[PDB]
Amino acid sequence: QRPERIKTTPYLEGDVLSSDSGPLLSVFALQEIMQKVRQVQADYMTATREVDFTVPDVQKILDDIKALAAEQVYKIVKVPSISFRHIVMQSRDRVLRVDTYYEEMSQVGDVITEDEPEKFYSTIIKKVRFIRGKGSFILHDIPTRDHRGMEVAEPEVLGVEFKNVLPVLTAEHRAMIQNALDGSIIENGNVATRDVDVFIGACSEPVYRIYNRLQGYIEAVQLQELRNSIGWLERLGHRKRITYSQEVLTDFRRQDTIWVLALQLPVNPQVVWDVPRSSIANLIMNIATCLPTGEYIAPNPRISSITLTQRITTTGPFAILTGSTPTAQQLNDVRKIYLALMFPGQIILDLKIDPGERMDPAVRMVAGVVGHLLFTAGGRFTNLTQNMARQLDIALNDYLLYMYNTRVQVNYGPTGEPLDFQIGRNQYDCNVFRADFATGTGYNGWATIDVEYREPAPYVHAQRYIRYCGIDSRELINPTTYGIGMTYHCYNEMLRMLVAAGKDSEAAYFRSMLPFHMVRFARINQIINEDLHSVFSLPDDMFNALLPDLIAGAHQNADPVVLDVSWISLWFAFNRSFEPTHRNEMLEVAPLIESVYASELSVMKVDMRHLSLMQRRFPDVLIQARPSHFWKAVLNDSPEAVKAVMNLSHSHNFINIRDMMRWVMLPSLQPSLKLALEEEAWAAANDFEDLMLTDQVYMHRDMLPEPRLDDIERFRQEGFYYTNMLEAPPEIDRVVQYTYEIARLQANMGQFRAALRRIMDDDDWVRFGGVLRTVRVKFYDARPPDDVLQGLPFSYDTIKYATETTIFYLIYNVEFSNTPDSLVLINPTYTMTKVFINKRIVERVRVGQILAVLNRRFVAYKGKMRIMDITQSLKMGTKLAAPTV
Amino acid sequence: DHRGMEVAEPEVLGVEFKNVLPVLTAEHRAMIQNALDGSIIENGNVATRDVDVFIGACSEPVYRIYNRLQGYIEAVQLQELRNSIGWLERLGHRKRITYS
């Protein structure tokens, strides 16, 4: 089906040794990363905080991330919720109308205190989430009826409840209310073949804001964005060379369907790579979601030995090594070697030292020979540290200087550095094989170009093409040279140096084994340039800057993971090739996962950015705050799958204040429906008055009124009531301004009570500003208890400044038996506290204006329509009919 | 934490005045509280690593020993590990020993 796996000669056919896949290798890498630090901390004495290093189930986390995409942020209801109610007095033509939104809003979060900033942040987040959840809804299949040839909405869909006020009315007011009810006709309702119903109802302003924004977003995002997303998926599949079926997607849209779309494919990769200390997590995710499934193939057994007669056979130089089998640890080290090879700069190999083994000394020398032509230490990226390179150079020197045949002449140089000599009759110089990271003189990438740029990529962050030892992937299909002509510079120099050293049989063996080596790196290049291209790959800037930081020893934010291997593992990995067989199971699903992850991260970031200014806005309320407090507050109300992805390497125990403060400032966002709704709700929540907590609290000595009851029915009709609600605050003059510090200092000196009493006797006003307080609302028909009649804004426990305050509405009731002087007392009663709110909550309104809140325009889809979520169809394998630009 | 900046708790300071607070009057208690709130810790950089620095109380010989130990640690962190590892590498090259 694909021409690069067609084998025409038995040279490339060998027995299967083992197999590996992405889900196994990711868990293996994480386990070997964590076990190393566990062993190091166990062996030596360490002084650090107690943290447990465990390994999670990556497959379950990926499944949870995928399942997160099926959730919906909106609701479909027949009627809107009630937003207005009424309270009926003894009056016959006046009622008290109350807006229910503020009353439900006042009881959402915990009471604000002066010593728990985390609870304050949690309360703010919960209030914003409640506003967003209530705001977003879509109307569908509203009930209507017929009246005089017009379509009239039922009273049920209207957001006003007025059933309890009907009996107390009179004939004229009932007729007026009935006429007002009958007048709310459905606009353009007399025509057929419609799609929406337009009418007039009542709703609160903050909910109306999110409703309008949601309707606008539903109208805006349409087939064009879906076409763009499918086109981007088509380009990505074209790069990945995924096969396509003969089924295509058209742009036909049924007359009874309305699409929604909450995600987009062109994900800004920066949002992924701005997360602090996320290199390990991104690498693990990339291995988990992109690595294919393949098996290891050994070379053909006939390359080493051939038979001329039954008792005459050619013998190879490494017959002892090739007649050996690995153990489990050596197999693990071979897997580590291949894992380091398939990721250039993010994984770096080292050496493992332990005295628990007895190995033949020739194994180390052969490994030192193999490592020079197996690994890369060039001038653009490296696969190993400097120490391993030095050890390999020393091993190569030991192999060269040890002779089991007749000795050849050698001339030593002035310095005592390894490989500093000339060997052989023709005086071949061995100084070029010593490691030099500036040019990569002794390893692969000696005189070859291994990183190039060909075409713009679907992912803008990664544009590089890797070519190990100069092999292009097209050489397996359309070669440009014969079998003899396949070579490159470093390997040829290795062969010539081996010949000059008097070792001819080893040179012949390597010359025979070269094409298998070349084909193996061709397959590795194809794998790294075809399937591993994803968001979680390293950007070009960090990839370029990795090597100079390692050379200079400077601090870097993308420190590679370093693993160790054994000597025989180099030979074992040299005698294998990785040949993929199946593609990854989740290859065509990953971009949706990345989009969901980016959208959740963007929502979290905007929440942090909006909460970061609270200390600057209100200094006295958040004295003991840190960024970590609202960090925990934001993390406590997020999906757990995103947190699991973000904390693969147990990073959250190590971020300090500066790192998270840096991350919040970074301007990168991924737009989505959830982000738009959250931003709109946050914009509606900038005014703290809508959140029902304020600092306009006053104290002024006032008298509970004693009206003259000279005409009982007149007093009943006028609708007398009392409240501590201030319709307008007093002037800036004749008021005094108190502060938390001033009040605390005066209270600690035993002077607060006297000062307040002296102010009160002067008939002035005092403001306890600077501190937000939770406000509640209560209604009373009799005299309220002294807990609220003579309450105070502060409590004695030193004083507590942030104490909740209750606005109370007292309703007067009189009988015919009351004398005109039946409410007067010799000693007056006093009430202290008052609260001013610029909004309008409870109003005394005449019965003729009950239905005067009908000033909102509502559009509702009909009963024949359907609303579907199409975000699950955004898969890589889908191909559209008419291509886009 | 106070007013957006970090302070040191009374325990980490090298004084003991827990048993004198009960008998203090209001002005003296307020003054002591303000003075305690006035102990701001700063951040510093030694051996390309960040540390906290603050003000405390100690006796002269103990402070001298502690200062010498701190200076020795600071000098070690930027020269001695590198010098020792280089010497290990040279000795292992000479005597044919591999050091981990």
Question: Which structure tokens are listed for B43?
Answer: 């951040």
Closest CA to A719 of A87, A92, A166, A84: A92
Instruction: Give bridge partners of residue A312 from the DSSP assignment.
Output: A309
Tell me the DSSP string of A294-363. Answer: EEEEPPPGGGT--EEETTEE---TTHHHHT----HHHHHHHHHHHHHHHSTTTEEEEE---SS----HHH
Tell me, yes or no, if A434 comes closer than 8 A to chain B by beta carbon: no
A78 backbone φψ class: left, alpha, beta (φ>0; ψ -120 to 50): alpha
The answer to whether residue A355 neighbours chain B at the CB level (below 8 Å) is no
- Under an 8 A CB cutoff, do A625 and B89 touch? no
Please report how the helices A590-611 and A657-665 are oriented relative to each other, as an axis angle in degrees rounded to 10: 100
Q: CA-nearest residue of chain B to A397?
A: B93
Question: What CA–CA distance (Å, rounded) separates B71 from B82?
Answer: 17
SS3 A775: strand
Q: Output b/e per residue, B3-29; b: 16+ Cβ within 10 A.
A: eeeeeeeeeeeeeeeeeeeeeeeeeee
Longest dimension (CA), chain A: 137
The Cα–Cα gap between A611 and A629 comes to 11
Helix (H, G, I), strand (E, B) or coil at A859: strand
The strand pairing partners of A783, in sequence order, are: none
Q: Give the 3-state secondary structure of residue A6.
A: coil
Tokens 């003054």 appear where?
A: B31
Please give the structure tokens belonging to residue A748: 């600690």
Q: What is the DSSP letter of B37?
A: H
Pairwise CB contact (< 8 Å): B98 & A626: no
**Residues 6+ away with beta carbon under 8 Å from A123:** A108, A109, A110, A112
B-chain residue closest to A623, CA distance: B3
Residue A472 CA, distance from chain mean position: 37
Cβ–Cβ under 8 Å, residues A94 and A719: yes
| Nearest residue to A513 (alpha-carbon basis) of A560, A575, A568 | A575
**Exposed (0-12), middle (13-18) or buried (19+): which is A371, by Cβ within 10 Å?**
buried
CA distance A184 to A201: 8
Nearest CA in chain B to A622: B3
User: Which helix (H) or strand (E) segment is A520 a member of?
Assistant: helix A504-530
From residue A504, how far is each of A138, A492, A508, A509, A532 by CA, in Å?
Answer: 82, 14, 6, 9, 40
How far apart are alpha carbons A521 and A528 in whole angstroms? 10
**Residues A678/A606, Cβ–Cβ less than 8 Å:** yes
Task: Give the residue carrying structure tokens 């990953």.
Answer: A590
Residue A660 near residue A276 (C-beta atoms within 8 A):
yes
Pick from A218, A66, A234, A25: which is nearest to A136 by CA?
A218
Handedness of CA B59, B62, B67, B73 (dihedral sign): negative
Of B2, B48, B100, the CB nearest to A623: B2
The answer to whether A156 and A143 have CB atoms below 8 angstroms apart is: yes
Place of tokens 């028909």: A781
- Please state, in angstroms and rounded to a whole number, the distance separating the CA atoms of residues A588 and A608: 33
The answer to whether A776 touches A756, Cβ cutoff 8 Å, is: no
Q: Which residues does chain B have within 8 Å of residue A746's beta carbon, measured at their own beta carbons?
A: none
Backbone angles phi, psi at A60, to 5 degrees: -65, -40
Q: How far apart are CA A847 and CA A841, in angstroms?
A: 17
Contact A236, A229 (CB under 8 A): no
CB A86 within 8 A of CB A164: yes
Tokens matching residue B7: 């302070």
Range list of H helices, chain B: 26-37, 60-75, 81-95
Contact A749 B26 (CB under 8 A): yes
CA distance A107 to A123: 11
Give me the resolution in angstroms, 1 decimal. 3.3
Q: What residues pair up with A98 in beta bridges, in sequence order? A: A85, A842
Collapsing DSSP to helix, strand or coil, A177 comes out as: helix
Burial A501-529 (b: 16+ CB within 10 A, else e): bbbeebbebbbeebbbbbbbbbbbbbbbb
Asked if A672 and A602 count as a contact pair (C-beta separation under 8 A), the reply is: yes
Query: 3-class SS at A537?
Result: coil
CB A607 within 8 A of CB A634: yes
Name every residue whose Cβ is closer than 8 Å to that of residue A607 and which is 6 or more positions away in sequence.
Answer: A125, A634, A678, A682
Comparing C-alpha atoms, which of A619, A636, A650 is closest to residue A739? A619
Three-state secondary-structure class, residue A7? coil
Q: Pick from A807, A669, A639: which is nearest to A725 by CA?
A: A807
Cα gap B2→A622, rounded to integer Å: 9
Can you tell me which residue has the tokens 């010949």? A499
Rounded CA separation A856/A62 (Å): 44
Q: A590-611 vs A58-67: helix axis angle to the nearest 10?
A: 80
Q: Which residue has the tokens 């640690």?
A: B73
Query: What is the C-alpha R_g of chain B?
Result: 22
Conformational region of residue A469, where left means phi above 0, alpha means psi within -120 to 50, and beta covers everything else: left
* CB distance A62 to A73 below 8 Å: no
Of A430, A434, A471, A440, nearest to A376 by C-alpha is A440
CA–CA separation, A172 and A184 (whole Å): 19
Widest CA span in chain B: 75
CB-CB contact of B42 with B54 (8 Å): yes
Q: Torsion angle, CA of A649/A597/A641/A221, rounded to 10 degrees? A: 180
* Cβ contact, residue pair A391, B100, below 8 Å: no
Residue A372, H or E segment: helix A361-374
Which residue, among A564, A555, A594, A537, has the nearest Cα to A345 in the 3D structure?
A537
Name chain B contacts of A745, Cβ cutoff 8 Å. Answer: 30
Partners of residue A856 on adjacent β-strands: A201
A580 phi, psi to nearest 5 deg: -65, 150
Please tell me the number of Cα atoms within 13 Å of A676 on its side-chain side. 21
Contact at CB, A353 and B100, closer than 8 angstroms: yes
Which DSSP state fits A243? -
The DSSP code for A761 is: H
The residue type at A708: R
As a whole number of angstroms, the distance between CA A442 and CA A433 comes to 4
Structure tokens at A210: 């999110």
Is-contact A352 A318, C-beta < 8 A?
A: no
Beta pairing partners, B44: B51
Tokens of A387: 């120490």
Nearest to A297 by CA among A524, A580, A4: A580
Contact between residue A867 and residue A218 where contact means Cβ atoms under 8 Å apart = no
Rg of chain A in Å (alpha carbons): 39
- A651-659, long-range: CB < 8 A, 24+ apart: A651/A276, A651/A277, A651/A278, A651/A280, A651/A281, A653/A49, A653/A51, A654/A277, A655/A276, A655/A277, A657/A626, A657/A627, A657/A628, A659/A276, A659/A277
Q: Do B89 and A390 touch (CB under 8 A)?
A: yes
* 3-state class (DSSP) for residue A501: coil
* Residue in B26, B3, B27, B1 with CA at minimum distance from that of residue A740: B3
Estimate the crossing angle of helix A361-374 against helix A567-574, to 10 degrees: 50
Which residues of A are less than 8 Å from B1 in CB distance?
Answer: 623-626
Residue A200's identity, in one-letter code, is: I
SS3 content of chain B, % helix, strand, coil (to 5): 50, 15, 35
CA distance A748 to chain B (A): 7
The tokens for A274 are 């701005």
Distance in angstroms (rounded) separating the CA atoms of residues A577 and A516: 8
Which H or E run contains A41?
helix A22-43
Cα distances from A51 to residues A41, A502, A653, A727, in angstroms, run: 11, 57, 8, 57
Rounded CA gap, A310 and A294, in Å?
37
Q: Does B95 touch chain A (CB under 8 A)?
A: no
Q: Round to whole Å and give the CA distance between A243 and A344.
A: 28
CB A520 within 8 A of CB A580: no
Evaluate whether A623 touches B3 at the Cβ level (below 8 Å): yes
- Distance (Å, whole) CA A416 – CA B94: 10
Report the C-alpha gap between A883 and A106 in whole angstroms.
54
DSSP H helical segments within A145-278, as ranges? 171-182, 205-220, 223-240, 270-273
Q: Who contacts B6 (Cβ-Cβ below 8 Å, separation ≥6)?
A: B40, B41
A626 contacts on B by Cβ (under 8 Å): 1
| Short-list A84, A86, A79, CA closest to A167 | A86
Contact indicator for A704, A828 with CB cutoff of 8 Å: yes
Contacts 24+ apart (CB under 8 A), B80-85: none
Strand A16-20 relative to strand A293-297, pairing: antiparallel
